């Protein structure tokens, strides 16, 4: 199968959260709309993967520190 | 007097034909020529399949080449003197344009 | 039933009186499935009965129709000898007459020594076939000296 | 009012469209009674919805079905889906939504593919063999 996320996804998600933490939340369908206006992303299929890992990171940041 | 008069367009590339065709509709609508909207005909595909090797040695691989052709129709209700005006602007890209004086 | 005779002799050949009549008479050479049906259709015989159920005058009606097709209006395009080379006639050839008609054809080709006659004499394939890989009937030969 | 609906069903390349309207209980496929579609080994497959729901639910409407494409068996499955999908769409528009739920639940508890399509289509052939996965023979000495 394999669902592991490549460094192009994981680095873009971290840089979005460092700059726009106050805009983001737990709803994937709202995060998917925010990430489309704060960044230039070449593909719809890449935009969905970035908003997915951003949604995973927000639910971690609500519990404690993330080292990056 | 007026006629019912027909224009047809053809190309390989789609998105240049879109901008050519949209400009023909605008120039007709602003002059009230009662234009009938773009009819999309079925797409046509040409195909050629060849061995890759120049000499007949090796494992038996093939190349699959194709070309696609796109076609449209628009109909106007107007004099023969003014299709000659509107069928002369924005036509700069590699698109065929052909017109016939009665087909409706 | 009538316990009637169930093997019968027709043209110097034996017929089993036990098959359907249209498939019993194809034991004669020169009479295939296609020709046997048309002969019984002109002879006014019911195809449903077994060959041992024909009467003595019914077999004589079939035999006299097989030997003279053109007088009972069987077409010319049906026949197995067309414009016979030596006398120009149209007919059907049967039984031991078919053996001799082929025997005369192979000797006629050999006497003038045409290519057909030489291939028939040397025992090789007569029509257009290749001979490198098919029709093998000898023995395997070893490479040793 | 005038009171009618048009809906479709599919399998492989076959498509069937059913029109139904306020009426007395007629059902036809290509102008023929559905008791007389040719592969009668499968006659219980196109009877399934009316045998399962009962004829009292069909008594208010006349249904006419048209079908083309695919082969003999794929068309029975297209006809079957068009009829059961038409009745629930007619009930949704013109009667109470509480009665739509009875129809949809009884159909799906017997068989999916009375109401949802089957997505399977052919694989394309590839060079070096007779089909999609098979390959020609290999030899060495």
């Amino acid at each position: 199968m394999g669902r592991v996320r490549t460094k192009t996804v994981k680095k873009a998600a971290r840089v979005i959260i460092e700059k726009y933490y106050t805009r983001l939340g737990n709803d994937f369908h709202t995060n998917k709309r925010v990430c489309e206006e704060i960044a230039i992303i070449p593909s719809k299929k890449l935009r969905n993967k970035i908003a997915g890992y951003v949604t995973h990171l927000m639910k971690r940041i609500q519990r404690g520190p993330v080292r990056g | 007097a007026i006629h019912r008069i027909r224009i047809t367009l053809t190309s390989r590339n789609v998105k240049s034909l879109e901008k050519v065709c949209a400009d023909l509709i605008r120039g007709a609508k602003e002059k009230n020529l009662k234009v009938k909207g773009p009819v999309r005909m079925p797409t046509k595909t040409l195909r050629i399949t060849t061995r890759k090797t120049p000499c007949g040695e090796g494992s038996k691989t093939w190349d699959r080449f194709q070309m696609r052709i796109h076609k449209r129709l628009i109909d106007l209700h107007s004099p023969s003197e003014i299709v000659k005006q509107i069928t002369s602007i924005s036509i700069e890209p590699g698109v065929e344009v052909e017109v016939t004086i009665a087909d409706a | 039933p009538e316990k009637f005779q169930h093997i019968l002799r027709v043209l110097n050949t034996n017929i089993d009186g036990r098959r359907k009549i249209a498939f019993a008479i194809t034991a004669i050479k020169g009479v295939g499935r296609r020709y046997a049906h048309v002969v019984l259709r002109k002879a006014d015989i019911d195809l449903t009965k077994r060959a041992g159920e024909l009467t003595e005058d019914e077999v004589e009606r079939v035999i006299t129709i097989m030997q003279n097709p053109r007088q009972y209006k069987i077409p010319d395009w049906f026949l197995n000898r067309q414009k016979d080379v030596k006398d120009g006639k149209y007919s059907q050839v049967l039984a031991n007459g078919l053996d001799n008609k082929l025997r005369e054809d192979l000797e006629r080709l050999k006497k003038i020594r045409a290519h057909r006659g030489l291939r028939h004499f040397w025992g090789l394939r007569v029509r257009g076939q290749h001979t490198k890989t098919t029709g093998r009937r000898g023995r395997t030969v070893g490479v040793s000296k | 009012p005038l009171q009618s609906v048009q809906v479709f069903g599919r399998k492989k390349t076959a498509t069937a469209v059913a029109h139904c309207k306020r009426g007395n209980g007629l059902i036809k496929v290509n102008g023929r009674p559905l008791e007389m579609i040719e592969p009668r080994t499968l006659q219980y497959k196109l009877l399934e919805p009316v045998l399962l729901l009962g004829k009292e639910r069909f008594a208010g409407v006349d249904i006419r079905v048209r079908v083309k494409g695919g082969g003999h068996v794929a068309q029975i499955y297209a006809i079957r889906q068009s009829i059961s999908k038409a009745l629930v769409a007619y009930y949704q528009k013109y009667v109470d939504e509480a009665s739509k739920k009875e129809i949809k639940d009884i159909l799906i508890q017997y068989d999916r593919t009375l109401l949802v399509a089957d997505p399977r289509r052919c694989e394309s052939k590839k060079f070096g063999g007779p089909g999609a996965r098979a390959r020609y023979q290999k030899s060495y000495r």
């Binding site: - | 390989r12 040409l46 050629i48 060849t50 061995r51 890759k52 120049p54 190349d63 699959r64 080449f65 194709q66 070309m67 | - | -």
Partner: protein
């Protein structure tokens, strides 16, 4: 000079040859191309054919 200096060439591999290089083997008659198969793979991009699948 001879009066019989040619033989009929109205069909078969004697009639036709490549438009680029005059060769007679493996040429393409499809859509009016009349190129050799090795000359076609060389000019396919300029003629306007592409591969996608």
């Amino acid at each position: 000079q001879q009066l019989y200096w040619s033989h009929p060439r109205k069909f078969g591999q004697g009639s036709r040859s490549c438009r680029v290089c005059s060769n007679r083997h493996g040429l393409i008659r499809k859509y009016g191309l009349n190129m050799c198969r090795q000359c076609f793979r060389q000019y396919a991009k300029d003629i306007g054919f592409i591969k996608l699948d």
